Amino acid sequence: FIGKIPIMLRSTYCLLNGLTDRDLCELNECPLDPGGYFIINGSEKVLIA
Amino acid sequence: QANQKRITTPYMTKYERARVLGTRALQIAMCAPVMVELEGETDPLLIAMKELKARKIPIIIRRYLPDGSYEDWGVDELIISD
Amino acid sequence: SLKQRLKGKEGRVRGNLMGKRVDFSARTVITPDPNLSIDQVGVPRSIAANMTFAEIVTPFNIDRLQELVRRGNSQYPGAKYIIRDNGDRIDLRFHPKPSDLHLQTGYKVERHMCDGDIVIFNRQPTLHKMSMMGHRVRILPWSTFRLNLSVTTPYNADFDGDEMNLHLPQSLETRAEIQELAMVPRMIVTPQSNRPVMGIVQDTLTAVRKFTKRDVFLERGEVMNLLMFLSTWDGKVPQPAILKPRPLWTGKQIFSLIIPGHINCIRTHSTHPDDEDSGPYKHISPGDTKVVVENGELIMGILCKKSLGTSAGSLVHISYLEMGHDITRLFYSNIQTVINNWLLIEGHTIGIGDSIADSKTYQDIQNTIKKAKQDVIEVIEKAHNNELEPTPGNTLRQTFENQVNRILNDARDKTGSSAQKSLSEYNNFKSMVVSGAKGSKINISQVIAVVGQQNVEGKRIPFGFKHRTLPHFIKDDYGPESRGFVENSYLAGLTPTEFFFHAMGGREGLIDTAVKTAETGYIQRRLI
Amino acid sequence: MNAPPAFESFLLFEGEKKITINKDTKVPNACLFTINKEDHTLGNIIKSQLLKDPQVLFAGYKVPHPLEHKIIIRVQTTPDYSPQEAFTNAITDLISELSLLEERFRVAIKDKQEG
Amino acid sequence: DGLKYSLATGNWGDQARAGVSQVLNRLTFASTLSHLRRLNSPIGRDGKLAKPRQLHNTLWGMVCPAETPEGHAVGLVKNLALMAYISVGSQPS
Amino acid sequence: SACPLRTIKRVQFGVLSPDELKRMSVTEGGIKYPETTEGGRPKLGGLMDPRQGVIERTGRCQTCAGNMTECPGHFGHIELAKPVFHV
Amino acid sequence: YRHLALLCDTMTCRGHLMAITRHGVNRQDTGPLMKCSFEETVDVLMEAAAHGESDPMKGVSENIMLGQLAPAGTGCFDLLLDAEKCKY
Amino acid sequence: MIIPVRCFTCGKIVGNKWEAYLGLLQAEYTEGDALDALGLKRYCCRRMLLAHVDLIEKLLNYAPLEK
Amino acid sequence: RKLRRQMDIIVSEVSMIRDIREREIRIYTDAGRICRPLLIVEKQKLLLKKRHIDQLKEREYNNYSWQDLVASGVVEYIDTLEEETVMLAMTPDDLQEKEVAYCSTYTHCEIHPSMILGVCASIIPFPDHNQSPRNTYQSAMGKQAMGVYITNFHVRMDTLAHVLYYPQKPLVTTRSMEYLRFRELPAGINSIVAIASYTGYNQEDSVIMNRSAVDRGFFRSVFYRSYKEQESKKGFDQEEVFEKPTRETCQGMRHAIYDKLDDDGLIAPGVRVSGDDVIIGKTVTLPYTKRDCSTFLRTSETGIVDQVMVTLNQEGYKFCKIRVRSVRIPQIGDKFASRHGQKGTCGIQYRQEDMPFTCEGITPDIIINPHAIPSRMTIGHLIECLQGKVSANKGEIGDATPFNDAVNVQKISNLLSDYGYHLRGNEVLYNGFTGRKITSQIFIGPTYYQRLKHMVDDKIHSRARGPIQILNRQPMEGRSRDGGLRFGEMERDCQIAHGAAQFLRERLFEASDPYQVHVCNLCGIMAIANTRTHTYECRGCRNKTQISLVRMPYACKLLFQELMSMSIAPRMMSV
Amino acid sequence: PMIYICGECHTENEIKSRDPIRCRECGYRIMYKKRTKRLVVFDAR
Amino acid sequence: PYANQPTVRITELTDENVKFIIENTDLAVANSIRRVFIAEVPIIAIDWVQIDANSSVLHDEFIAHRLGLIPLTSDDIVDKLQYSRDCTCEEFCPECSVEFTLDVRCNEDQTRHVTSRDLISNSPRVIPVTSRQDDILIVKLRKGQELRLRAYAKKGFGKEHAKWNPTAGVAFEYDPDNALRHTVYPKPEEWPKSEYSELDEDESQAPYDPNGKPERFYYNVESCGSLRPETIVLSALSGLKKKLSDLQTQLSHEIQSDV
RNA sequence: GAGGCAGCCUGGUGACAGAGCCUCUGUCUC
Ligand SMILES: [Mg+2]
Ligand SMILES: [Zn+2]
Ligand SMILES: [Zn+2]
Ligand SMILES: [Zn+2]
Ligand SMILES: [Zn+2]
């Protein structure tokens, strides 16, 4: 073990990946929330290009 | 300087009018005597303007010249524009 | 470091001595109120309860100040503190015992800001002394500051969410300065240009123009409505301009009661033709386009911005010169309150009807453009044939670009005057362009006829691709379509390329706004 | 925070007079009526009814400001007829019109229900 | 903590270019969708040169012509056209 | 106060004489210790010297009845073991 | 024009092109307190200290910084109680 | 979220017409005929149902705090 | 080109550029190139045939998707400098045989020209009918419109959120608004807008609103404020705890109210909270026997506790969030917008009695001034009110996509005629106060308006001897601190030009940082002064007998001490 | 004690001063404060 | 010098609306009549709510907002209730309020629509209009969600809040062919003719009448349901008469003090 | 990726977030 990489939500390495709309609602996720951001210390963060 | 060879104009400037009224209003609020028969007025800044238009405010204006001399003008000696 | 505490902006001198944060000040959004005098401001009742003025106790007022103390801070009419001769202050917020409600001469009571208190009122950037003027307080419901719309002209204010700062003067000696030096009525005329800084504007100006036509006849019940708003009126109803078959007054005849004293003034309306002063009817003006005020009475002519605007020698300038500030206060206040109440009968609007022209006009516009574009093709044929020869001192390219700019500037103005001639006297764009309240004859041309050439840094749209403007055009295409001539009106809608070129031109205006707003205080600081 | 309570548009506070009568000193036989907690609903009918009286020389109304709920009505009359009488008359004429209009609506109802 | 710190602060280096990693805007859904599609040019905001702020011809179909912020950021902060795709790269082998 | 109120009619700039600093300073032996505190309370000749001002929001200072607000703060000095350039 | 003139007079009254730059101002005869409010606050006061300069307290910024009635407008004159006219 | 009780402009009740409106659309009515059949004559009322978005059908996917 | 279209050896994202005059061929597989899909054109024909649309229609259950369109060689990704080498048709109209031939060798075709716009620019109807600065103002204002921001907003404890009660989808919609999911999560309401000069309260950019619509919930919203709080153990023997404080144990106890707290030291949801109510009781042990760290509800709010949740943080200390809600019924001063850069505050609210009404009894929800239109040339705002009046009557949602040659203001006018309205959308109104017809026929229609994040009760502020800074002893900074307003350099510049010297010394001194120093007469340096002993001294001179009192700003005393720390002697001479 | 509701299995559990927050029967770590019992009055406006 | 003598025709009457025509009255009176229809006819509507549980997806004042808007049958008891300002009791009593109750829990496995049908009242006179025509949806509940609340309805009128406005609309028209020229059409041929128009297809306006004034006012009062549409109109005429006779009394008392 | 001044400075206010033990960043408003 060398460290932790923060994972981009709904990326292929997220736990929300591939879930269907019915599954995300069980997690209290929004099915329309696009992901594509990180959570750090509970704050959603966007890497502007 | 004496009341002779005054070179400043006999008009009271707006700045002198502003400060004379402000000063006299503050005096009237500090229970100075009133030099005019008031007619139901009670605001010291309205009484001040009544004393001004009557020419009754007991103030002398000292106007400094840029050479460092000064002229004294009684408020009654000055013409009021308004 | 110690130097860094002092170095400059936000350092001690500039940051805390040449400017600083102050007690007894308030800020909120501003909103209109046409029911205010130019010398009034509408203050939220919460703000008026939060800010106090220390009033000295005297036998002239102690009976009143005992009540405001006895009401205390939970009421709006009340006081926050009593200051003793010692400077010891009783706080009235938390119920003090009767020993501390005692009042004697020379105490200061921190009474709440009342109706008729005087305040300085300001908007940043404070570009000239007319951006800080004295107002008289009127307390109102709700949380915004209200100012009369004429007073928006000095401040450069508008009600799209602007905020303004109120400063409450705290002593009679500085209360008197603001009254005697800085009140809005004393600020009507500016030493920068001896013009008046305040005019009539927006609805009142478009209504003023419409109200003053010959066509405006008013029945007895309408007149008695308008005359209810004149504060200066003497109570004498004027004999109507028409007595039979039906009593009718005229708009000019009631405006002649708004105009103060015996002012004498002459102006022209914006549409006054060039010939009319030289041919017959030098007087008895056909279109009523020549304004004549005599003895304080509006004898003839349509009033507009040329007459009641902020320019020199306007009817409202001459009012200030002849009558002074105290009366010209009332002149601005009366023009608005009667003529905004008349616009409840006329109304005003703009819609899709006003942005449309006859099928005759649209064919005139299309035939103008179709020739202009074919003329530009002829100039190109000359250049490509090497038949074009340069103007003196100019490059061949500069010659070509000037000739093409010539043809298309002609087309923009030929179609624009065709569109304006096409406008019926009912048209509501015309009703604002002719009053001058808003808009201009180029806006009418762009909405109805042709948006025109789009420029980047004063040139036809650049070849930002290799020898062409966009991937859609072939290379070396100098024609009007290729280089950013928007041959469509806003009603016709832009084509895709025209929409992009119109964004390229609009961006330069957005950049230059940011650059010029990035400088507003710079020169004024160095000068001062 | 600064919202006026909505009942304060029509309920008087303690010691508000509903009406106040002041002689207009500008011109003879003129008078000024201040009506608390009323609006265009009651101003415009009394103006219109006053304008029918041939002994009324001026009638007009305004609300001084829309955010505070009162009307001022100004009435001028010929000599030998007070504006107090003109105002009291105009009210009684409106009460007579409304009760007469009401009775005729009740009849028209029955004629429409039972027919 | 090295990957976490710059994502937490936006400072793109060891404690640098600031203003990467803004907080995701959660005022309205169009805000959120725009924030995830925003682009930034690192040129300093204090200079008065207009040329980098102008809408170049080659933004056609790639970057939104209409959307840019007010103030000193004008024309530098930009947003993608709805069908604009940014390549992710391959090896040329 | 007993003293006459006066306007300031001129400002004279200059440099403090190092003897005037010694004469002016209330830290009669100079600052000697990097520490702020003795037994938690302030160290005389340390960087919170109770003659050099009022320390606490309700305190006093040794040189005048300072009331926190009324005390202007008083100057101290460090005697530099060797002269040094003022930058 | 009376404003355009007053700028052109001030820019030239001292006999040279008085550019309104930092040193263009910091060659004026104005006092050290006014100069420190513009461009180079500390460096101005170092040279005032090293040369023992003085400020006569007769500019506006000067009297502002020390909280006294500016030599301007409503301040530029003085008032005396007419103790004789107080009789009437 | 949920259909307004009143039309904002005029005070006509529309909070009882939403489920009927969807039923009429299930019956392959147009929105025009469905609004007509419901008695929504004024365009100020027709815009209430024609433009409503029943997001409460999305809030009820999430399980409550208490079962 | 062939291999990339077949996707054989070359990934379709590879870009390839012959530069024929340079005799260079360049190939880029580099990351971070920006590119866009274009339809391929061969021999003046699209390669996209009707069969492709049929298969794309079956996408609901058939496997065929966009990948199969790319893999077929029917669309191509092209980058910002391969575009230097293409000829683009704007529509397949450009491929048609024409009497005068512009180009006969197109290589690609634009898919739809409106796809040059972005997210916030695609929620705008008829943007090809607007002055382009106003399309930019909306794209900024769109991001500030309230709506529903995400569906799971009840679990999220976001520090600020605004959710609208009754958002609607627009009656007038750009097709791209589908992909934005603006139907599912809309941010506005269709409102009846009269473009009329009414009583004048909509002058400049102000707006009049129907108060009876506001009573019925028009643009009503709720505001959510979330407070986090965190327990800890500090060192060996200091602890914070959430608990109900008490004045017999906690030093910092206010006279404010702690009885809203439960025994855990937290409120429970459903309790009514106001500014300076304690929402969390927190204490820390003191070496009284605790200091008070309780959090207070941020002042000038009133609300109700919506949720309280309690957890362990990363370190295992008790960690807490409280969410508070308050409803915001729109006031005058609240800011609204039209999707066309027509921002504006509510200037007054008139009840349904007083709003101008049509023969049908329709009052407007909003009245805006006509003077907002001529200089700004937001003609798209007028066409929306027309297309929306047709759409609300037809029972349709109107296609306001830009560059749509199939729609015209003439065609929309014709359709409006058939419903018994004047074809240009004017309507005869009656004055609400007097009932008389208005002489002008007002333009009325349904228009999509927005409520923006900016509200007057966030912004209303006043100062009157509040808190004071430690160093400067001047007023604090900013509304949140009860801060005073900055009377800046340009403000004093005006008060000089006004000659208001006594106001200027009031506002810039006696109403900010008044102070007194004693000064030695013999040298201009501050004297020691024992006001309650009546003794004074100039250490430096041994003067004990001739010392002045001098009023001066505290920030000026501070400057002179900060100058003395640089060895400068700013000697103030009173003589 | 207070009663808090688990965020994962919606069960009540009683919980108390200084007691760590964890949920019996499932081990989940977020709790909600139930809802108040004192009366609040709304205008239907 | 005295009152107008107006006359009425009723041209349509239903449970939903009345059409009627008033002739020979002032436009001022015709307008103040339609103003009273909107805002000074009293009705009963829910004004107080105490929520004892709410587990729905709407917050407590979102539901209480919707309860206020539900139209309650008012016809018979509004005249008998006092205003809550007038009654001498502390808090409420049957003299000035109508008590309502609503308890719902969704125990079934599928969405329970809570509606006006679930509001339950202390008396029969006062039920929701949709029960006195599908019921107004208050909230939708998921399985395990719950809503129980106690409410009171009170007498008031549409000046206080639009929940007390009894009308779903008020048409008002006069001079339907523009004989008075109180509006001026820039192209009169492009205007649809009014319902009450009396013109052929080709003539576009009545020719100008310089002698005329407004004389014939066309109304269409539509009820929301709290009152029958004709008892709205009778309540307005009785109320507006009461407003004027309140003036006349207080005016007479002031004359007996000016004099 | 631009000046200018003798390394620093780039026009007035304003409002919120984030990061750190009051300071810094970003976005936004007129
Ligand atoms: Mg503005
Ligand atoms: Zn001391
Ligand atoms: Zn409706
Ligand atoms: Zn000394
Ligand atoms: Zn659990």
Numbering used by the authors:
A (entry chain B): 148 to 196
B (entry chain F): 46 to 127
C (entry chain A): 338 to 865
D (entry chain K): 1 to 115
E (entry chain B): 442 to 456, 462 to 539
F (entry chain A): 11 to 97
G (entry chain A): 1395 to 1482
H (entry chain J): 1 to 67
From the paper:
Transcription by RNA polymerase II (Pol II) can be repressed by noncoding RNA, including the human RNA Alu. Here we present cryogenic-electron microscopy structures of Pol II bound to Alu RNA, which reveal that Alu RNA mimics how DNA and RNA bind to Pol II during transcription elongation. Biochemical analysis revealed that Alu RNA binds directly to two molecules Pol II via independent interactions with the two halves of Alu RNA, Alu-left arm (Alu-LA, also known as scAlu) and Alu-right arm (Alu-RA)2.
Three-dimensional (3D) classification revealed two minimal Alu-RA conformations. The first RNA conformation could be resolved to an intermediate resolution of approximately 5–8 Å, and corresponded to an Alu-RA–RNA-like conformation. Thus, stable binding of mammalian Pol II to structured RNA likely involves contacts similar to those formed within an EC. We conclude that loosely base paired regions within Alu RNAs are important not as a mimic of open promoter DNA, but speculate that it allows the RNA the flexibility to adopt a conformation matching that of the EC DNA–RNA hybrid and downstream DNA.
